Amino acid sequence: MDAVKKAILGEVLEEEEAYEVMRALMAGEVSPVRAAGLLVALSLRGERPHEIAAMARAMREAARPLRVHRRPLLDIVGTGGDGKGLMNLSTLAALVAAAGGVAVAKHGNRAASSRAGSADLLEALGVDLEAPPERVGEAIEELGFGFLFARVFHPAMRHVAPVRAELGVRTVFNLLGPLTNPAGADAYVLGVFSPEWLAPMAEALERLGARGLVVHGEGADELVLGENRVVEVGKGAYALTPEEVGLKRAPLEALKGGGPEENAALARRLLKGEEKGPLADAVALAAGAGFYAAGKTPSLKEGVALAREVLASGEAYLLLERYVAFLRA
Amino acid sequence: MDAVKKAILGEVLEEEEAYEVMRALMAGEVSPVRAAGLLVALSLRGERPHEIAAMARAMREAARPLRVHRRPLLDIVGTGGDGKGLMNLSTLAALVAAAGGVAVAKHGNRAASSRAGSADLLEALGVDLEAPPERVGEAIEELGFGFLFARVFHPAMRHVAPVRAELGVRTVFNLLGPLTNPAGADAYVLGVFSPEWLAPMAEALERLGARGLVVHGEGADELVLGENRVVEVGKGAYALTPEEVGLKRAPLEALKGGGPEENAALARRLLKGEEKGPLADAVALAAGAGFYAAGKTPSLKEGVALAREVLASGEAYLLLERYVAFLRA
């Protein structure tokens, strides 16, 4: 029986079938009606780690090829859809990590008509999102940082997004986004929207041959200055608080930021080491987890300590401008 | 929240939320993509009786209106989709019931599966399927019989038909068909494709203020000359065998039909009272369940005895002819 019909029927898909269904979606072989039915059936059934990993493979394989030598290669990405609208700090944590000596290939996208997306912020900072995949790869090899704009690497998403937007609910694609880095990143600080996804996503990463931390910060799909929950690949689960790594707490509101126009100005002051409020602490936290995930520092605390020093030096801003100029003719 | 979204999320709808969802669909306000999604979500978590009845009322409200004064008004119909291609026994049984003095408003359509649907049979017999609704209502109150062609009464279904065919699976619409009699029939012999739908559908009919039996016969969505399962509105569940109503068993193969003309040929022999084989027994069984559901006979046994006589009298054929001509008058 057809793999898509089987999914629509709500039956659990075997690894091969799950891969086939995603391959067809990415190949533009599934009508919107069936894509819609398929996605609803999976979100209601509860996608399993083996299905998740296999579909992740189908997606990666369908993307525009790009190979990078730099290793370890870190990515600080989230599943999105936490439903809170805080300032995406992953992008800034990525720049901090790259400035700190870790090769980074940050997977990102635009905020669905919200302008609060990583892509939106970088562009506002001077990043020409039109740069071909080859040039981005070159930036990763030479500068140690690259921003992988999902539109550029995943053509089929132009046809999937409308289906997702109309369904208006979370689907398997929220999980696959972080698991489909098109540069082959192998170290992660992957945030999820609900704690129920920490364990299964950690296994998904392990299945894909990756490592790092899967995190969740009190409802948010990113580390916050509160009672974070974490799951380490190759290790287990545990809580991570600010005080534990030398940082003090602060309400989520302190990490809300503001309008897409205001976020850009903040980013600059943050990367320069000018801004030193709760935003600078949450950036250090995620960057620290990155340093640790990629093996740059032996512990999370030393990772955060490095991130604060890097952030305070302003070198992360010099890297951003270096990258901006690198993409220009 | 939005009713359609709540459905897509897999949550049980409140009755009026269910009414609202179907009203939007029939009004053509739901994109085929969100429609495909809600339909899959509903079929997967299981539709409840209160939801089914509410959606049925919504659907009835969007159909071309037709009011019939004669009561009780009997309909012998099934959910269809059982894949067996049997002769159109319910249409013949409906005519036998009408020849017995019970006002009948039989709901039906052409068989897309292949051919030889209730509408196809009657068309071959000369019924003008295009006869306006107001005309069919005149026949019902004058000749006691009428065929309600779905295509003619439910133009709004064109907004949904495409999504049902594309999904390729059963949805709530397979259940609503028999619950949307355009004439407001209140007595039923309603067949379902699977036994698990007997009780929920009986409850749905009760909520709709209707009376009668919901039946299932060894895989078939109608009464067969075998071990039948029944759930009567206001009485409960029970098995129904040919023996207890004075009939003899026989295999489904004997109830097989064929093309529209062939089916029309047999229909002529049966209604004229010339063919006394298994087909005659099956027609009597259903027509008898109809007399009983409509309150014409105090029991199924008596209804079957009356049905056998009416069929053997050839009276049902005279009625048909009176029907055809009436539509051409």
From Swiss-Prot, chains A, B:
Q: Function of this protein?
A: Catalyzes the transfer of the phosphoribosyl group of 5-phosphorylribose-1-pyrophosphate (PRPP) to anthranilate to yield N-(5'-phosphoribosyl)-anthranilate (PRA).
Q: Subunit arrangement?
A: Homodimer.
Needed cofactors, names only, are: Mg(2+)
Q: What class of enzyme is it?
A: transferase
**PANTHER family referenced in this protein's UniProt entry, alphabetically:** ANTHRANILATE PHOSPHORIBOSYLTRANSFERASE
Reactions mediated catalytically: N-(5-phospho-beta-D-ribosyl)anthranilate + diphosphate = 5-phospho-alpha-D-ribose 1-diphosphate + anthranilate
Q: In which pathway does it act?
A: Amino-acid biosynthesis; L-tryptophan biosynthesis; L-tryptophan from chorismate: step 2/5
InterPro entries according to UniProt: Anthranilate_Pribosyl_Tfrase (IPR005940), Glycosyl_Trfase_fam3 (IPR000312), Glycosyl_Trfase_fam3_N_dom (IPR017459), Glycosyl_Trfase_fam3_N_dom_sf (IPR036320), Nuc_phospho_transferase (IPR035902)
What stretch or stretches form a coiled coil here? none
Q: Binding of 5-phospho-alpha-D-ribose 1-diphosphate: at which residues?
A: 78, 81-82, 88-91, 106-114, 118
Q: Which residues bind anthranilate 1?
A: 78, 109
Keywords from the UniProt entry: Amino-acid biosynthesis, Aromatic amino acid biosynthesis, Glycosyltransferase, Magnesium, Metal-binding, Transferase, Tryptophan biosynthesis
The catalytic activity of this protein is classed by the Enzyme Commission as 2.4.2.18
**The record's free-text note on cofactor binding:** Binds 2 magnesium ions per monomer.
Binding residues for anthranilate 2:
164
Give binding positions for Mg(2+) 2.
Answer: 221-222
User: What protein family is recorded?
Assistant: Belongs to the anthranilate phosphoribosyltransferase family.
Keyword Magnesium on entry: yes
> Would you tell me the Gene Ontology cellular component terms?
cytosol
* Listed name of the protein: Anthranilate phosphoribosyltransferase
The Gene Ontology biological process terms listed for this entry are:
L-tryptophan biosynthetic process
Q: Which domain of life is it from?
A: Bacteria
UniProt cross-references to Gene3D superfamilies, sorted A to Z? Nucleoside phosphorylase/phosphoribosyltransferase catalytic domain (3.40.1030.10), Transferase, Pyrimidine Nucleoside Phosphorylase, Chain C (1.20.970.10)
